[PDB]
Design an enzyme around this catalytic site. Structure first.
Site, mmCIF file in Angstrom:
data_model
loop_
_atom_site.group_PDB
_atom_site.id
_atom_site.type_symbol
_atom_site.label_atom_id
_atom_site.label_comp_id
_atom_site.label_asym_id
_atom_site.label_seq_id
_atom_site.Cartn_x
_atom_site.Cartn_y
_atom_site.Cartn_z
ATOM 1 C CG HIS A 208 -0.314 0.159 2.527
ATOM 2 N ND1 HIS A 208 -0.040 -0.925 3.334
ATOM 3 C CD2 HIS A 208 0.126 1.261 3.191
ATOM 4 C CE1 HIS A 208 0.563 -0.487 4.438
ATOM 5 N NE2 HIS A 208 0.641 0.842 4.381
HETATM 6 C C1 MJ3 Z 1 3.061 5.277 6.542
HETATM 7 C C2 MJ3 Z 1 3.597 3.884 6.907
HETATM 8 O O1 MJ3 Z 1 3.448 2.965 6.004
HETATM 9 N N1 MJ3 Z 1 3.991 3.784 8.273
HETATM 10 C C3 MJ3 Z 1 3.714 2.635 9.161
HETATM 11 C C4 MJ3 Z 1 2.155 2.552 9.154
HETATM 12 O O2 MJ3 Z 1 1.801 1.237 9.566
HETATM 13 P P1 MJ3 Z 1 1.621 0.056 8.529
HETATM 14 O O3 MJ3 Z 1 2.552 0.407 7.374
HETATM 15 O O4 MJ3 Z 1 1.881 -1.193 9.351
HETATM 16 O O5 MJ3 Z 1 0.098 0.135 8.082
HETATM 17 P P2 MJ3 Z 1 -0.869 -1.132 7.843
HETATM 18 O O6 MJ3 Z 1 -0.208 -2.262 7.062
HETATM 19 O O7 MJ3 Z 1 -2.056 -0.506 7.149
HETATM 20 O O8 MJ3 Z 1 -1.332 -1.672 9.299
HETATM 21 C C5 MJ3 Z 1 -0.698 -2.779 9.963
HETATM 22 C C6 MJ3 Z 1 -1.748 -3.531 10.779
HETATM 23 O O9 MJ3 Z 1 -2.935 -3.872 10.009
HETATM 24 C C7 MJ3 Z 1 -3.155 -5.280 10.032
HETATM 25 N N2 MJ3 Z 1 -3.882 -5.656 8.827
HETATM 26 C C8 MJ3 Z 1 -3.396 -5.449 7.591
HETATM 27 C C9 MJ3 Z 1 -4.072 -5.762 6.507
HETATM 28 C C10 MJ3 Z 1 -5.274 -6.258 6.603
HETATM 29 O O10 MJ3 Z 1 -5.973 -6.543 5.618
HETATM 30 N N3 MJ3 Z 1 -5.841 -6.440 7.803
HETATM 31 C C11 MJ3 Z 1 -5.170 -6.189 8.940
HETATM 32 O O11 MJ3 Z 1 -5.743 -6.431 10.048
HETATM 33 C C12 MJ3 Z 1 -1.847 -5.915 10.336
HETATM 34 O O12 MJ3 Z 1 -1.957 -7.159 11.021
HETATM 35 C C13 MJ3 Z 1 -1.160 -4.849 11.210
HETATM 36 O O13 MJ3 Z 1 -1.404 -5.046 12.595
HETATM 37 O O14 MJ3 Z 1 1.513 3.488 10.059
HETATM 38 C C14 MJ3 Z 1 1.748 3.119 11.433
HETATM 39 C C15 MJ3 Z 1 0.986 4.045 12.343
HETATM 40 O O15 MJ3 Z 1 0.836 5.232 11.996
HETATM 41 O O16 MJ3 Z 1 0.570 3.660 13.462
HETATM 42 C C16 MJ3 Z 1 3.230 3.263 11.734
HETATM 43 O O17 MJ3 Z 1 3.510 2.820 13.084
HETATM 44 C C17 MJ3 Z 1 4.088 2.516 10.693
HETATM 45 N N4 MJ3 Z 1 5.480 2.774 10.973
HETATM 46 C C18 MJ3 Z 1 6.408 1.816 11.066
HETATM 47 C C19 MJ3 Z 1 7.818 2.361 11.124
HETATM 48 O O18 MJ3 Z 1 6.195 0.584 11.045
#
Ligand code: MJ3
Ligand code: MJ3
Ligand code: CL
Ligand code: NA
Ligand code: NA
Lengths: 363, 358
Positions: A208
């Site tokens: 994404h």
């Molecule tokens: C902008 C960017 O990509 N920064 C980072 C961003 O997070 P992430 O990139 O992880 O976004 P995501 O993938 O949408 O969500 C993951 C969850 O969805 C679940 N997930 C995923 C897909 C799905 O279909 N269903 C789910 O339950 C999964 O099981 C996961 O638990 O924004 C975070 C925030 O601001 O707190 C930052 O801490 C982060 N920074 C770091 C450094 O990791």
């Protein structure tokens, strides 16, 4: 002993972090929680399903801001959040991760002298073209409390002149979430049945990030690599809504049909997909770590990661999307791999450590 | 040629931008674009600077101001970015430490437009000061940091910012004094208008929130100045907000007792500064300017970011705890001076800045 603690959340991964934390604050006596949802993720598979499955009370406020530029989003949120803070007058503002919401919240609070704590502090990509890199740097510099999940993050904050006494290594609240909701995922997910997959019989993908989806050739590289891997091992892909919009707009929509392309799933289903995959390929920060949690090898489709310990422990491997053929080969090679045994991200009690620090601080 | 867009919102930023503009007009391949964010908007707080310091009409007036931190900053952030999207400059320059400065930097850095902070690395180490937050956040957002002092350099290094992004160029406000001093000598009639003799009066400016929002502190200051006035005339161009606060608390009669004025233009200020026996201020600009003219300064604060001025004995801190104590400190410092020292550079801070942007 009556303390008001206001959390600012905008997106899926912030909802998950806030759940872990809110679970513990809910058991803190004399703590009233207020939750502001800034509006970035509003679809029910990006938002409400997290509130339901993870047992989070409905937000006290929905600002409904999103869909514009960094300036619009960030500036409207700054003004909107400050309006809430003047009415709620909390003792603490918690901000999470590194979105525009996070910074808007930290900045709304600090100018009103309301203590701010950053959950997930001190992560650095060293690539300032990432908006998240600006967001967490400025956030961290505006915070009174810095809840670091790793030693790298600690070192990052010390090196930018932030005092030890504001920095706390508490581990990763997302590990708490994986620990505390694991059994509930086990009990209630039917995603493997529904898709007809068995354990170690597929590869799980999410993609994404703007750098990957906002550029036609880059996205093509990724989807064609996934379609190729799908030939040898089935590929499950819960496509972020914007990744679907961008694929469609670009004419790359056919490629999603050549894999098991789903809509976004909820956390409980996500846990079961992650736990049971042969390999996880992602450009998500949270999924990187969760791959490690379940001891499933990871490939990260980026030029860097903030989660450097995963690379060092050999659980993760970067594969920037320059060539479809090579990216597929890497993905299949890494499926054969495992990292070294090691304990990162704490004991599952990062949220308790956070709660303790918030109540016993001296405000 | 290269496009350099400047964001300015307040009096001191118009002054700093005047000096920088003077160099950039004369630079071969530079187009200048100027955004006035709208924060200072009277004639005597804004227009007078554009006219007298030969600042070309701003390309955009955003007309924002008068709200909270959240309102002003968020709306400036949105509007400035809108301008950056149209103009697509190669550099954004931001100045000082107001909400405008932070909003400018943050609009730019998310669009990948290099930001340079003019007056980088100043620190009070009191993060309840809004501008302390603004300059920290700005410095960490910027690509180039134009530090005016060694202390500022050390502040920036201590926060991890690499030395290749830090340029000690001196202070563009010294440029401005130098390069518009003659003009001021020629044009200003204010001493004559006010029946003042060179070195026969004290000059006071007071506008900081910690001094004007606290009724006790403001009373201490305005009583002290009234007392000092009995010994040597006090001339006081009153920041409009300071006037409002004084009137609100019922302290208008202390302004009547001194030579209270409305804000003055820079040429008049230079003349008033030069010719003052002593300067009493809480302005950052004015305390430096006191030193520029070798006039003893008293800073009505518990600290200053301009620490070299204290070290050199040209400036002295006097917290407004007691009206008579403050008056006695002021009269005592009138017949002091500091050491021989050259601070803030040679008057070509703006030229050094210009060169680095190419
Ligand atoms: C902008 C960017 O990509 N920064 C980072 C961003 O997070 P992430 O990139 O992880 O976004 P995501 O993938 O949408 O969500 C993951 C969850 O969805 C679940 N997930 C995923 C897909 C799905 O279909 N269903 C789910 O339950 C999964 O099981 C996961 O638990 O924004 C975070 C925030 O601001 O707190 C930052 O801490 C982060 N920074 C770091 C450094 O990791
Ligand atoms: C929040 C705050 O107080 N930040 C500081 C603030 O500066 P200052 O306090 O000096 O404001 P000011 O006194 O209104 O203007 C002085 C000029 O007006 C002229 N001046 C003054 C009075 C007058 O009647 N007529 C004039 O021509 C004088 O001759 C001077 O040339 O804003 C600056 C900015 O963002 O650029 C910051 O760099 C700065 N931070 C530091 C560290 O000094
Ligand atoms: Cl909106
Ligand atoms: Na932990
Ligand atoms: Na009078």
């Amino acid at each position: 002993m009556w303390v008001k603690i206001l959390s600012v959340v905008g997106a899926r991964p912030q909802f998950i972090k806030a759940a872990a934390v809110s679970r513990v604050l809910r058991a803190s006596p004399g703590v009233r929680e207020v939750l502001v949802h800034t509006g970035q993720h509003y679809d029910d598979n990006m938002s409400q399903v997290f509130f339901e499955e993870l047992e989070i009370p409905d937000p006290d406020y929905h600002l409904g801001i999103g869909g514009g530029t960094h300036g619009q989003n960030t500036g409207r949120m700054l003004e909107a959040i400050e309006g809430v803070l003047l009415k709620e007058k909390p003792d603490w503002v918690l901000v999470y991760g590194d979105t525009d919401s996070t910074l808007a919240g930290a900045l709304a609070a600090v100018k009103l002298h309301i203590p701010v704590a950053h959950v997930e502090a001190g992560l650095r990509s060293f690539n300032r073209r990432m908006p998240e890199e600006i967001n967490r740097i400025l956030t961290d510099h505006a915070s009174d409390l810095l809840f670091a999940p790793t030693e790298t993050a600690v070192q990052n904050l010390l090196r930018e002149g932030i005092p030890e006494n504001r920095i706390h290594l508490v581990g990763d609240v997302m590990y708490d979430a994986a620990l505390h909701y694991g059994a509930k995922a086990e009990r209630k997910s039917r995603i493997l049945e529904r898709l007809g997959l068995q354990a170690k019989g597929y590869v799980l993908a999410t993609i994404h990030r703007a750098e990957n989806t906002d550029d036609q050739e880059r996205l093509r590289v990724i989807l064609e690599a996934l379609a190729e891997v799908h030939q040898e091992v089935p590929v499950v892909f819960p496509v972020h809504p914007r990744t679907r919009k961008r694929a469609e707009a670009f004419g790359l929509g056919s490629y999603l049909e050549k894999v098991v392309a789903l809509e976004p799933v909820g956390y409980l289903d996500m846990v079961m997909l992650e736990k049971n995959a042969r390999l996880i390929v992602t450009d998500s920060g949270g999924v990187q770590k969760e791959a490690y949690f379940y001891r499933v090898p990871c490939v990260t489709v980026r030029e860097e990661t903030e989660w450097v310990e995963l690379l060092k422990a050999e659980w993760n491997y970067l594969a920037a999307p320059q060539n479809a053929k090579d990216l597929a080969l890497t993905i299949l090679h890494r499926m054969r791999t495992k990292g070294v045994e090691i304990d990162l991200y704490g004991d599952g009690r990062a949220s308790q450590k956070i709660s303790d620090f918030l109540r016993k601080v001296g405000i």
